[model samples]
Target: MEEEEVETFAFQAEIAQLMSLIINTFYSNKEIFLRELISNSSDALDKIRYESLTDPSKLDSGKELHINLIPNKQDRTLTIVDTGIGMTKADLINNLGTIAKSGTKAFMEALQAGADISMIGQFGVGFYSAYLVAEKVTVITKHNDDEQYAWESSAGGSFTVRTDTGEPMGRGTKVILHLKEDQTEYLEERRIKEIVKKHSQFIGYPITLFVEK
Candidate 1:
């Protein structure tokens, strides 16, 4: 049997410092994290649907581009689901581990050139914001061209990615947030609804909250 080769990459010292700065010093408004995440989710759905225009078969059968929020008060959990361009393992690593290809560089270059960079998706540490409210996050994604995967992290220094154990869904992503005790406010229907309406009303996609009777 052949052993699989392992790949590795290191973050620049400056990038590490910047990440620490953003994680520790920059975020004073905690609610903004939710807004940022929803915005990003909206963008992802839009990207996938737009791409699917050329090939509708890329989308999951009977799956429309939309966002769904489910809250579990008993477990203090919140889940965000979307039928979007799901991340492959490579995308998971490249997007969540590093900063260079995150569009931050181009946004910064535009800023330096005195061009209007406001329209750009400037992101470096958005994923880490999940740590603000969640002690653990489980991201399950099924990409159009890759096998399903589950990425788990505890907001500590380590994270793990493994092949999904469940039966494969056609395509999409689901993020499950295990909220901290104090963050239980996010599990409220009214609260989540308000946040969605305020930040994502113009998202060009339907955002639905599944309410339990």
Candidate 2:
């Protein structure tokens, strides 16, 4: 197999602050990480569901739209997969999030001080909350407009992006959260189910947890 080239990008200073804040500011509310993630998945699914109304082919040739949560205790990994509008390589790097131009300093300070996540949604930084539990995260996504690619990061100073070179999702994205040793509670079937029902019950798509035997 040919070796794949990887590109690395640095986080903006404000992004660094937001990431640090996401991990530290939430404290006991760490379980809500799953909630934001699934909410984003639901958002992605809705985008495609709306697109299918105009051009029906974006649904993987009529594939059912759903989200799958697969947890592996032995590997200490939790994967969230969805049949939505997968991201392009550019989207992976640029779409992570950015602070607004106005009041850049004050805006970042408020966010670091645990401001409303409702605003973080506007910044596109909600995904970084995964780092609160994950030591590292890997994303495999395929868009009909682009080839399959993987984006991996520890939410540190920089992140790496490379060609996926694996089975494609046809459409949508897959996220693997490599949990921190202390955050192993996420691997429990019951814990994940409860988190899903709590945050994603309103999701129109199915959110099923698959046990890896």
Candidate 3:
């Protein structure tokens, strides 16, 4: 079997500090992690759904767009899966690695200006919020125009990406979070359902929670 190839890169220093601010600012209301994550999933699903309208080939598999919250107690992991538009190599870098011009400075200004902090989605840092609970975050995704790839980071201002030569995701992105020992509350089906209900009940896609037996 051929080995998968990985590329590692560091996050911009300013972007790194922005990530820290997200955790320190929101860790007190960590439930927003689930909220922001699901909101992003909805965006991905919408992206593909809209694309398929112009080119039906985008979804060759005809898979329905949905989101699943899968909790694995054994691995101490919680995976958020969505059948949506996944990322290519460049997309991962630009979306996950590259920060916008003046992004960090603008975010800091927004912080001091007393803007609605819950609106981090406007800042496009919703993904980093996962750092609140997960020591590491892994995104396994398969884009229609790209091969399966895994983007991983420990929130240490750097990340590694590699092609996934194993099973394909069909189509979409799956965010796997290695939950912190103290953040195990996220893995409880009951607790997760409450969060989902509170934040994502209005989402267009069906949201399902999977608890390990």
Write down the lDDT of every candidate, Cα atoms only.
0.67, 0.77, 0.82
For each candidate in turn, the TM-score is: 0.77, 0.88, 0.91
Q: Is candidate 1 or candidate 2 better by lDDT?
A: 2
- Residues 60-122 of candidate 2 have per-residue lDDT tens digits of 543778999999998999999998888887777666533324444454677766676445445
Q: Which ten residues in a row have the lowest lDDT in candidate 1?
A: 18-27
Q: Which whole-number lDDT from 0 to 100 does residue 175 have in model 2?
A: 89
Model 2 segments more than 4 A misplaced: 24-26, 60-62, 97-107, 114-123
Best by lDDT: 3
Each candidate's root-mean-square deviation in Å?
Answer: 5.4, 2.7, 2.2
Which pairs clash in model 2? none
Clash number for every model? 0, 0, 0
Model 3 C-alpha lDDT per residue in residues 32-120, reported as the tens digit of each score: 88888899999999999998888988889546999999998889899999999988878888888665544556765776575555666
Look at candidate 1 and give me any clashing residue pairs: none
| Rank by lDDT (best first) | 3, 2, 1
Q: Mark the 10 consecutive residues where model 2 has the least summed lDDT.
A: 96-105
Write out the backbone clash pairs for model 3: none
